[PDB]
């Protein structure tokens, strides 16, 4: 009912959510009363297997995961989809004995709805997890920006620049690829701008620490001035990164 979120979520659930909305409108919402639904035994068994298989895989995902909200959050969705399958199975039994059965049609709507919504749940929970893996990269880079303040030698700065390399390269490849999977344009804009600001400020940071190391080893100059520019680059990078983390959590 609200937009699916990512291109994967939307392309999985969109055919289903479409077909359901129709089927409602039709039978339910008045309209095709005294109607007659054909025999669903075969399609409902196919669904029932696909829910075995989904709960199979998902229970592996659950026991074989590092993520702690993944562990706790997924299971309920297994309970939601199994329940909904149960309704679909009574639906098709009832319909076999009375094509015109109005309880059966209702079970089939709720059945279908609960399959859509439990799998929505399972996919949001999986996606939250994936977002957290980008947030970890973002948070560790923020942690490392905290430490720029302590570089004082050219050798520390060589070391600092070499650890912070991988980190920004990875953050950037993550946000870029994530941005592509997004379905809200106000959200892709935001991520990309932020990552652009970040990427362009990186050499500004390195230059500003070089300036700093260099007046802190030429025993004087204007060192206040050099340090506050460094502190401003670091705060601007931090703030952008904090926005990246925020906007990644947006779903609408």
């Amino acid at each position: 009912m609200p937009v699916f979120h990512t291109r994967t979520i939307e392309s999985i659930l969109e055919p289903v959510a479409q077909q359901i909305s129709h089927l409602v409108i039709m039978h339910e919402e008045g309209e095709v009363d005294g109607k007659a639904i054909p025999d669903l035994t075969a399609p409902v068994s196919a669904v029932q297997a696909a829910v075995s298989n989904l709960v199979r895989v998902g229970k592996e995902t659950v026991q074989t995961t590092e993520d702690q909200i993944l562990k706790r959050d997924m299971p309920p969705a297994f309970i939601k989809v199994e329940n909904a399958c149960t309704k679909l199975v009574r639906a098709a039994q009832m319909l076999q004995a009375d094509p015109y059965s109005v309880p059966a049609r209702d079970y089939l709507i709720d059945g279908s709805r609960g399959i859509l919504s439990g799998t929505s749940d399972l996919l949001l929970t999986f996606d939250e997890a994936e977002v957290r893996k980008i947030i970890r990269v973002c948070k560790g880079i923020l942690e490392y920006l905290t430490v720029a303040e302590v570089v004082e030698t050219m050798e520390d700065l060589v070391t600092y620049t070499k650890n912070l390399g991988p980190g920004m390269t990875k953050m950037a490849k993550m946000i870029d690829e994530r941005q592509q999977e997004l379905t809200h344009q106000e959200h892709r804009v935001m991520l990309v701008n932020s990552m652009n600001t970040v990427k362009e400020l990186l050499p500004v940071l390195i230059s500003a620490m070089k300036i700093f190391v260099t007046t802190k080893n030429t025993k004087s100059q204007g060192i206040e001035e050099a340090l506050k520019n460094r502190n401003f680059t670091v705060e601007k990078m931090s703030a952008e990164i904090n926005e990246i983390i925020r906007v990644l959590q947006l779903t609408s």
């Binding site: 077909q19 399609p43 196919a46 696909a50 829910v51 895989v57 995902t61």
Partner: peptide, 24 residues
């Protein structure tokens, strides 16, 4: 990664083929 997202898809396919069958 992948195995979960295909299982979900296969389920969504199937639910949709089932609600096709029902007419709508």
């Amino acid at each position: 990664s992948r195995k979960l997202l295909s299982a979900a898809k296969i389920l969504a396919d199937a639910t949709a083929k089932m609600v096709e069958a029902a007419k709508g």
